[PDB]
Amino acid sequence: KTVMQRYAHFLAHHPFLILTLTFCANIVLLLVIVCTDSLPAFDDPQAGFEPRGSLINQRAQAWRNFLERFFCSRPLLGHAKLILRRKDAGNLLNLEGIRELCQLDADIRRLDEFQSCSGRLCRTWNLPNYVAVLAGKTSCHQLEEHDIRNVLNLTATCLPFIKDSSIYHLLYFISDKESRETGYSSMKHTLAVLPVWSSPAALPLYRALQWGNFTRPIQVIGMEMGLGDRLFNTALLEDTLYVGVAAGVVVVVLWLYTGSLFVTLMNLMAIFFSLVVSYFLYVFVFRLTFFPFMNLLTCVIIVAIGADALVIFARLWHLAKRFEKVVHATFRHAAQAILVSSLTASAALFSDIVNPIIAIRCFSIFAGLTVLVHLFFAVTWMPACFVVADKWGSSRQYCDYFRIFFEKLLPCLVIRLKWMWMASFVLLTVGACVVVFVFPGLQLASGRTFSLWNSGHPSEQYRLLKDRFAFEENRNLEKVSLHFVWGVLALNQAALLDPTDTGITTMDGRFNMSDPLSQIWMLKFCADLRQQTFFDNSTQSDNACYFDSFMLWMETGAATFIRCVHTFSNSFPQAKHFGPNFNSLHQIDSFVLRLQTSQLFSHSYTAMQQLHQHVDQWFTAALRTAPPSLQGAWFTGDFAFFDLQQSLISGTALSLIVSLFVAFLVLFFTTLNVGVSLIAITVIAGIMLATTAALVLMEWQLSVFESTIIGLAIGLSVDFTLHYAVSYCCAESYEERELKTNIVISEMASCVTMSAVTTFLAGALMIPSDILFYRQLGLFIITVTAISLLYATIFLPACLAVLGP
């Protein structure tokens, strides 16, 4: 408005002063934050997300309660490196059988070990161990291998797959399977050698990565413990740094391509960093706000938002081609789009904050702060453009393509001419999207406790494939893991979406085991829990309470509940009082617990969560039946993973609803005349769901990362649609028909093209830079981009649908 125009004139008058007032702020923020704390440093690679679903609290509580109270025959602790049935390892095994190349590679690794990660021992052996008894020789003839294979097969009696005297060799085989009957060949070689013994330090790990690159007979996979976590940290460091740098480069390239701005555009990128600085600053005061993925989404979001802003500025410059006053008016029009984008981002933050996840919450905060930062950036960017106008050059690229804009215009025209046809195509795509959500199915599960895939690093990727080949070689060192207990210490988690330990010592509502009431209550618990857990199988059937009453009735003694509890605690004859129990030791008190095995533990939570839910209901009914109904947290280790998945699903849904709120807020910010962009926003959301489904087409499993990506994507898509939205809004009054839609699409097409290029660049740079560390994020970004472009072409058909029939 007038005052807004006045601020614009204030900026125009301060084409340099205004810019300084922001660039300096960025610098100061960078310094203060750097000095105050080392925010860029990340404590851990793991997300550690807290589900917060009435069960996550119980789990955290159980955790807290428990916490309250010949030569070189290296063991498993020594970092093992096994390569089996691989093209690289295959060459090694074939040459080992012929020229003994594998043995030489192992020796070379030992030589590298002497330098670092080396009393020091030469090397553990799997294949060299067999012939080692006869003699240690790098020659490695075939006759020795044949004899070794014969003894390996002779060891079928002890383990089906002399021979007993080679006990150490037998252990070697245990470590290296599928090399006896199959033989020492390219087929499942399973190196399994220990170059370093008991070495989880980071420096040996770094050397291990290079060693894994066959820099020191080709070895495919190697492993390291403890050192693996350090490697993952290094992965987050180097890989994310590279992808981010590439992102900045692409953004700069795009800026020059669109606006041919060599300093102001660069200043926009620097402004993105400034924004990150502001976010970091404000967040630090309110909380730690640290998460690796938070940084990843931060860089991605910044790239996209800044891209949008630059797109806005460029659109204004194109419309420009008093002049400063009209420039200001264009600044206002674009400011609307900037505001729309910011709205999308902020609501995205709201989505990630609704579901409290140690990871999702941080991403949300970074997004929100960076978003408001992007708004101030929308201002500064405008100032940057103003300065560009104030000065061209030091004191030159024509940047013009023949009929390119016209070519896009014609593309918009063709899309518009077949308004009915394109509309049908989009609707069909929407139907296909919903179908995908149905079939194969929206819900997905992770294949393990930590994550379905938890190795983004290449060397770590080899280590993961090694983990699988190890599962083949060595048995995974699953069974049921339920454990009902006495109570809950703190149902409320660490205050406000904060990853922390709310309490250290347990707590429970003061309840006493009334001799007649409690014993029978525990007995009933044992009976029903027997019907659910025992399942006619032998596994921790005895209950710390019923067994106690039994031992007491057998001992016949020496207010029965208190005395009996005291006697049992004093005695604890069987299984040391069932291992952990009576955690209420601060004062003489009796606590209860029970490790059960009702159902098998499954990595996937499709049914594992079904079982946890069934058990949850059974426990709920049991608690209902109990007369004192004293709260007891019946948590299970598996219940935690199931909850993580449940929370991920809850977050996705809450995010979608939040997206509904985003669309509503957008139209509320962009719809005062007759009609509303809600129809369009809904179409966009459908496109977002379509993108999610497309990710499924990419087989991206449903995981925390997948969730965060779905959120950021909802944002990117909303911004894409925002342009067309504001346009249709403005054009309806002017022509109210396919003609208005044509012109609106004409102006929109430019924005669409720019945003498309921006997203494509960010996604491409990020996905290739990291081999699965953040590749899922880049792929998701690309998916969002594709769905966005599709939705872009369909955006205008939406307007057509808005036109009266």
Numbering used by the authors: 11 to 79, 150 to 198, 205 to 247, 282 to 336, 342 to 446, 453 to 526, 561 to 642, 646 to 726, ...
Which of the paper's sentences describe this entry?
Dispatched (Disp) is a 12-transmembrane protein that plays a critical role in the Hedgehog (Hh) signaling pathway by releasing the dually lipidated ligand HhN from the membrane, a prerequisite step to the downstream signaling cascade. Structural studies have revealed common features of RND transporters. They typically contain a membrane-embedded domain splitting into two pseudosymmetrical halves with six transmembrane helices (TMHs) each and two extracellular domains that are associated with the two transmembrane halves. In this study, we report the characterization, expression, purification, and cryo-EM structure determination of Disp from Hypsibius dujardini, a type of water bear.
The ones with higher yields were then combined. This yielded the construct (dubbed wbDisp*) that consists of residues (1–111, 123–530, 542–1116). To obtain a model at this low resolution, the recently published structure of the fruit fly homolog (ffDisp) was trimmed to poly-alanine and fit into the map, followed by manual mutation and adjustments. The two slingshot braches create a wide opening with a gap of ∼21 Å at the bottom and of ∼32 Å at the top, enough to accommodate an HhN molecule which has a dimension of ∼20 × 30 × 38 Å. The water bear Disp (wbDisp) has an overall similar structure with ffDisp and hDisp, despite that they only share modest sequence homology. Specifically, the inner leaflet part of TMH1, TMH3, and TMH6 shift towards TMH2, compressing the membrane core region, and this is repeated for the TMH1’, TMH3’, TMH6’, and TMH2’ in the C-terminal pseudosymmetrical half.
